[PDB]
Amino acid sequence: KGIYQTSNFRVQPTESIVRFPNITNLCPFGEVFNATRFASVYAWNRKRISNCVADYSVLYNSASFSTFKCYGVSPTKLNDLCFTNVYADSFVIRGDEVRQIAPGQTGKIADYNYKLPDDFTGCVIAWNSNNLDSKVGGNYNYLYRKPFERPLQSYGFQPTNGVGYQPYRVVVLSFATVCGPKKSTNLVKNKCVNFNFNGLTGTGVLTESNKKFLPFQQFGRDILDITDAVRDPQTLEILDITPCSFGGVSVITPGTNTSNQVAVLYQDVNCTEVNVFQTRAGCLIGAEHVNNSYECDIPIGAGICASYQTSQSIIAYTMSLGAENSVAYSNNSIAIPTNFTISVTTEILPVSMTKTSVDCTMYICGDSTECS
Amino acid sequence: AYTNSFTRGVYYPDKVFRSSVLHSTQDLFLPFFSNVTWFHAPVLPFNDGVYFASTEKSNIIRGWIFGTTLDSKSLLIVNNATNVVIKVCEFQFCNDPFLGVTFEYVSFKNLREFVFKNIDGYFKIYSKHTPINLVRDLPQGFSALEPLVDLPIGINITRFQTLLAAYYVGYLQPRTFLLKYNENGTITDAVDCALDPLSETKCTLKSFTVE
Amino acid sequence: NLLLQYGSFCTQLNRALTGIAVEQDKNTQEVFAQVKQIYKTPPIKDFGGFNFSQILPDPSKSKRSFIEDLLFNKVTYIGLTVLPPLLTDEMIAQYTSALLAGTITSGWTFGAGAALQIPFAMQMAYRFNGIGVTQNVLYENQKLIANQFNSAIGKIQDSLSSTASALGKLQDVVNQNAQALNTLVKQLSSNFGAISSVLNDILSRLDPPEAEVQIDRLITGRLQSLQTYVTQQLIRAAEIRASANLAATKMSECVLGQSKRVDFCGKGYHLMSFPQSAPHGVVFLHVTYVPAQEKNFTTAPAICHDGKAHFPREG
Amino acid sequence: KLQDVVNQNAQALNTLVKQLSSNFGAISSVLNDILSRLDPPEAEVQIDRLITGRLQSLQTYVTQQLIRAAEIRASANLAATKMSECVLGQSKRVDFCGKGYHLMSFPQSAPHGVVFLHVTYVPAQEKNFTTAPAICHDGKAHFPREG
Lengths: 372, 211, 315, 147
Fold this sequence. Notes:
The first copy, chain A, has 372 residues and is mostly beta strands.
């Protein structure tokens, strides 16, 4: 008979939420990939792509470039990455030169006009230019001849020609500030959730709070530096973080050899979160409440005790402190005993431990010198 | 010339709210009761960070060049009539620089205090406006500076020049400070733990009251 | 998955702390539960002029005595939990009211057998007889002894209410437990030679076959810090037990009786004491006879009348 | 109490022996495996992990033994005092010798402990009387010498 802490339980998070600011200040990709012109193949022209959202998911999904192919990166993953600082290089040339847009290569572009480093991590693509950069009088701007080294003549570029002689508007972006967009998601309240605010992962019951952060403050901390609150980066509102509901799961029983039904106690939770009975010690289940009081058989806590009684069940009750007794006092009444009892009563005390000794080398290293 | 850094150049260490709590931290701070070099109006180094405290009726101190050569070999920070330019460029100034009477940004009776710090490759600025008149120097009250900007730059900033009647400079030192955040989440008081043995005791008990 | 490789170190701490938690209910019973019935005071307070309205429970209220509410006013989530005491303070108030109502209406007899009524001045006439003062000195002074004790109880309000440091030991025990749990939380933010204290970021930043070594440093540090806390808790609990056993001993000899042990029941020749409950502890108001104004006399060890020597029988 | 002390000593030794089966992050909990599967310069890192593990356990166990030995000594000194006062005498200390006014007690040996039979006197059947604190005779007051 007793109460035993069989397990500890935790409400698992029902959702995961991710929150970041409004997705402003993107890089100007239309100034390179959607430009009205591109430089000669012998003289490729460079621009800068940094201190911005680098929206690489638009390029990875795009079909306008023949292939947005990367020498040392994944094009779908690139929207989650950041480059140290990105250079965007652009040129116009005949489509027969399009195979030169890669590291470890040869020919008038790749070895003499628009060459790239052997270790260059960068993504390159071209849009077909027979409708956009060629001309029927000849595309004379297609001039061709170290890495990025910006004696020469125009390529025979033309719009009616086959795809080798038809030009393409080529460009590439090389590999901090060249950083892709962080994806936001919908917010959740009053449920145990995983969350990830601007750099602040955690798990908890989020709730709209009455605290007053200053305009620059993003996290709230408790006395022991426990993360206590956050500001949402999209609506400038402040949330408490309450930890997800958890506690011990004690099982209450009479002796097994007296009965098999048991009552379970979830410490310090509201019963809604789990017959049922709320107590100041937690939520109690399988026991049933009664208005009577008895000497405390099995302790629950907070003045509640439980026992097995009558058709039998586990009852739970506010414990008796023993029977109450008003003494018949006055300024003139005395009670005197007329007879007595010689009650022999046991007291018991432990007096010695089991006198243990240990061969600490046999315990730590038994049978090995290499261990010793 | 010199004058007393009475109790100035506290700033919110981080973007954290803390309420009715005695949080204590080490950072580059203006040490309490130091002497600032006071200028009434001049190359100055940038040893680790700068507390700065010009008071002017018309804010003629408008631009500071922070860098390595101050020349064409690098932050041009410049307030104008309605905007605040910042850029890193190799550029130039004359034998007597003055203003005619890669980034971008937009913004006596008053004292526009600042603190300017570069650390972990990131350069940052904080501010206060100072509502109170005193013609002599920086008052003996208390006031904490809120953040205004950050940039990564990767430049080993050595020294600076400020262009336009007075300005004051005090170099930051690594120190432990203890900070009294009140209910509203604002710093109401601070203790410089290295100042005197009483401050070494307050930073031991956390409490501003020592028994 | 790594913590399981360290064996019983997650079990035996929960067992050790449960061994403390079960014992705190026991300490509270060993002190307060020393009576098998809840004695009720009579309605009329005819205790021979001794005004106990400040130490008996106020029925207008939690049903505590006035001097207890001073004590309750004077003493002030990530994986840790505080279990409730088995006995709520509104029950400790009944036990202390029973001990007190017994001590008033029946003196010591409710410690031995059944509570027996005895008029309170007739009890004090025994309390004096127990310190070698003949009880005629009580009734010949009763109105003065009442005024002395009423006034002395008056100073207890002011002593507890006006002074801020008056409950040093209970505030110290609450402070030690506060600083222990505060330390235990602070230690979660310590690096222990791992790349971070943020366990989720370790898993985010490094390959699992490597990150295991970082997590091993945090587990090693945190577990050693938990064992440190548990060992401090067991050592501290052994001291709180020695305090509770001393309190139980005082309540046995000094509430339920009159201890002849000089300077055990506080200074002075002891008469009686009244318990009051307090946050995480107990207070005793020890009532003690202190002799005050001495005259100096010639004396002789014994006297001769007929060549026979005579000696004092009881003086 | 005695069965509890025997149970605590059993649980402590049983835990201490069970720790030998645990890895502590070593490649096996069987020390002879580590010493035969792997070469000594490789193996020593795993063995130093396992030694660090077992040593932390042993220091835990010895600390539990010391903390419990202080409890058993506090019990033994209380027993020794009860035998000095309550067997070798009659202690007037109320409830120091079990419920009642006290007469005498008899010790009994028990495994790792002691048992006392306290022979207390406990009053039983009471009658309630009119009483007076003293009695007049000639307008002088008379008081009881005892009772």
